[PDB]
Design a protein around this ligand. Structure first.
Ligand SMILES: *[C@@H]1O[C@H](CO)[C@@H](O[C@@H]2O[C@H](CO)[C@@H](O)[C@H](O)[C@H]2NC(C)=O)[C@H](O)[C@H]1NC(C)=O
Lengths: 42, 64
């Protein structure tokens, strides 16, 4: 679980949430409000 | 924090621009007669540096 995934030569390690809708997710987890990184099952 | 480096009469001039994580710097220096505002004439700035840092810039400030 140490390995993970989320422009040309862009890099950004930000924790800012994937909103799945226009919700007040406010950077906090919930239904339609998900953390930007996912782990590779290697 | 992934990178670090070390190298009124003086009109000192610079240009700064950034492209796909590269960051380019050019300059010129001259003594002048009038100090108040940009004196009429012509000269070209010449390159100094390019840094491959990757940052996504939108703002800046002078360090007085
Ligand atoms: C600078 O920041 C912006 C976000 O403010 C980055 O935008 C992303 O660009 C990619 C293009 O491959 C899109 O797929 C993403 O959806 C964009 N993000 C968002 C939140 O819209 C941009 O890539 C950054 N540029 C650099 C060179 O780092």
């Amino acid at each position: 679980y140490n390995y993970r995934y989320r422009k040309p030569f862009e890099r950004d390690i930000s924790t800012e949430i994937y909103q799945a809708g226009s919700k007040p997710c406010n950077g906090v987890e919930g239904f339609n409000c998900y953390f930007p990184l996912q782990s590779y099952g290697f | 924090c992934t990178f670090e480096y070390v190298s009124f009469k003086n009109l000192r001039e610079f240009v700064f621009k950034n492209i796909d994580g590269y960051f380019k710097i050019y300059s010129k220096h001259t003594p002048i007669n009038l100090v108040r505002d940009l004196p009429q004439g012509f000269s070209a700035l010449e390159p100094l540096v390019d840094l491959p840092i990757g940052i996504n810039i939108t703002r800046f400030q002078t360090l007085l």
